[PDB]
Amino acid sequence: GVAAILGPSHSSSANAVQSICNALGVPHIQTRWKHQVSDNKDSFYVSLYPD
Amino acid sequence: FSSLSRAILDLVQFFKWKTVTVVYDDSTGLIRLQELIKAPSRYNLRLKIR
């Protein structure tokens, strides 16, 4: 148990992380740019990275 | 879509086009077409995208 995870810096498993987080409701914070999937209706994520 | 891009490029050249526009849906189409997108380096092709 935590408040939130810090995302791994590579998109491949990053998607796993994210589809985990919003699946179990814990907010997710990402640092590395990922491939924005156009219709990923996830809602528990932000990214400090310059978009 | 790699080899597809080669074939498309062949078709383009066979028609001898000297201008063209590529249009996609979402940015993934880029990856889908990168090979053609690399047209200008080899032959005289000007292509644009929207």
CA distances from A18 to A5, A7, A39, A41, A42 (A): 10, 8, 14, 11, 8
CA distance A15 to B41: 35
Closest of A3, A1, A9 to residue A30, by C-alpha:
A9
* Resolution of the experimental structure, in angstroms: 4.1
Where does residue B28 fall: left (phi above 0), alpha (psi -120 to 50 degrees), or beta otherwise? alpha
* Pairing status of strand B47-49 against strand B20-22: parallel
- DSSP for residue B20: E
The owner of tokens 């998109």 is A11
CA distance B33 to B8: 10
